[PDB]
Amino acid sequence: STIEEQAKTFLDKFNHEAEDLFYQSSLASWNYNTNITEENVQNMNNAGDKWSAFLKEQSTLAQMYPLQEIQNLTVKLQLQALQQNGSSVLSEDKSKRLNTILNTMSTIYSTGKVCNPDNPQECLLLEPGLNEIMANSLDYNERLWAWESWRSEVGKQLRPLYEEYVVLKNEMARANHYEDYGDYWRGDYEVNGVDGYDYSRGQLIEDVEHTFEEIKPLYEHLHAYVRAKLMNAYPSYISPIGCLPAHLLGDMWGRFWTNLYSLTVPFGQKPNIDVTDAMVDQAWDAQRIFKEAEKFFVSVGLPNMTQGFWENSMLTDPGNVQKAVCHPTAWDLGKGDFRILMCTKVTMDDFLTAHHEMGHIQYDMAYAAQPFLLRNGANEGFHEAVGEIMSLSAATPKHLKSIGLLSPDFQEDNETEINFLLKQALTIVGTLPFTYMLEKWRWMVFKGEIPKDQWMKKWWEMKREIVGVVEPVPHDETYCDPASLFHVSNDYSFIRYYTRTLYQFQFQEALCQAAKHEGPLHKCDISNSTEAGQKLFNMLRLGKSEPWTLALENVVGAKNMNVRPLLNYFEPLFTWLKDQNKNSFVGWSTDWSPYAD
């Protein structure tokens, strides 16, 4: 016989034997997340051990199929995905030490509490703690203390653990024929075999830098506009030509600038769009929100949901002795089982979170016909982009007015549009430079170009160079502040967020141009359009068997990432910021520091 037939038979048998185990593991995880009991924990541990044993018995066995003798693309990709060894190349002692360090770091990050200096008995938590403190605060010393104590208490006991973790990851990368952890992360954006659609791990960095070189002026104008009001907000604190403090960005890490909308409002006399009062007066609930989301998603040409989706999902907080996690997550158990776990309340953000979860479910159901080794999206942030392109369309004033949430006597003016554009900008663009700087710093640390005695120095240099934030108190090389983040301490990447932020605008422009829309871009609506729905379904049905370049070319007609959608969307806001800053100063100096006087 031939090797291709044996490989296909082995792949089919592996899928048939792994579908049931994956379904059992998903059911165990669901039972653990719905009810927190010891039996559920034991069942989840047993399912995880069985899945690990299955992955071990399947590995080191399918290596009898060389990749140089396979002519099928799908079979070759599946064999390459199944031949990944992983952490099994290292010894047992090193793996045990790595697992112990991971568990210790997870326990330290999950168990955190800050006590008051004047009263040692007054110890506060984190979320009913510093988060709520930074959410609403009008004091400088309080925020400075909440920042310093946080970065000094939980930022000095994770340095050697993180160093040993980086060393072990570098050893694992060098053992798996890789250079470092950055290469292992960038290996996901690699397409080899198809002529005219190749992609390397070096072109992505060049494209990101080329896009950042054009995004930088907009970020500088936004920072200048924010500082123009921060100077009047806190007198004798903000420098006219200096940087901004790190404990005044809005939160602990300063990733989002949403909390600064109350202080940086252009026109405070105009009312805001709040459909919460209408929903309270009409006595709605989560069921009505889900029905409206379903009616919105079906009007574009998408199939309906299943009965198990409504008879097995938990869309209401029980509020009893049973404890559960209210974090909105999308679950794909398989065999036609899709459930959503979310504590939906009568608010405004939940109306968009429901649409996001419904878009995730639709994406998961799009590639339901693909094999078990192909039931995944073409990219990491692709699901988030598909959810956001629907959430932004559902958050339009026209859609809220057509369903009866807005009064028909509403007069849309220019100030409301400017405020909406600024609110969207402070949320979208306010996290791109920080993400880029953090990813570049992690890549430089994993590569080995930064010495061990200069980590914090290079971190603060990159901060003052890209983000433009100066520290209030200088720190030596004994702190471990960059590792105090959730995504950093749990081995998560950040380029997915930037790719999703680009792809959402790309898909929005594509859908608004395909639907024959006239007028501004922020007034576009994809409601009651079957052509855009069909064009999106033609791409969502691909899944993972096709490269992301072809899927992007079949939608927007381009192979690489672009920034023109964001510029075309923010052109009015950019012009308004330029008109406002014509009589102001643009730029900041890195020599100024709050501890210089």
Partner: protein
């Protein structure tokens, strides 16, 4: 009149038809090109279901050739896919029968369905199987009658 019955999934219902290919219509039960019969199926999810998996239904998946129309095969040999002789289950040796494991928490296409096929035969023999129409009786009138 012959009655054939089998249990399949909700997605394999379309494979039981004259002129269809796949895995069930080629390795377990194949229909000829011409078949003047009827296909009856219904949902039996609440009947044949059990928690923790119901591993009681099997099917033939791997075979060396295909099945002819109206052919029975209860073989339980070890399928060979390589050039080495079979010396037990292991490399290039897999079991031909697999289990389904139906559960009441599956979707709409992964549920057990009972399909019944009825075949008709007409040869040089008396026909003692017919189908169903009797009215009342009237007297003292010029009417039309039909007595067998």
């Amino acid at each position: 009149v012959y009655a054939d019955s089998f249990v399949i999934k909700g997605n394999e219902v379309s494979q039981i038809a004259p002129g269809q290919t796949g895995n069930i219509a080629d390795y377990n039960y194949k229909l000829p090109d011409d078949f003047t019969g009827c296909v009856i199926a219904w949902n039996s999810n609440k009947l044949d279901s059990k928690h923790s998996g119901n591993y009681d239904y099997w099917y033939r998946l791997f075979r060396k050739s295909k099945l002819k129309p109206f052919e029975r095969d209860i073989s339980t040999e070890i399928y060979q896919a390589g050039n080495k002789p079979c010396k037990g289950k292991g490399p290039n040796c897999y079991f031909p029968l697999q289990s389904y494991g139906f559960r009441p928490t599956y979707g709409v296409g992964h549920q057990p369905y009972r399909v019944v096929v009825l075949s008709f035969e007409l040869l040089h023999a008396p026909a003692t199987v017919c189908g169903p129409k009797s009215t009342n009786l009237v007297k003292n009138k010029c009417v039309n009658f039909n007595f067998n």
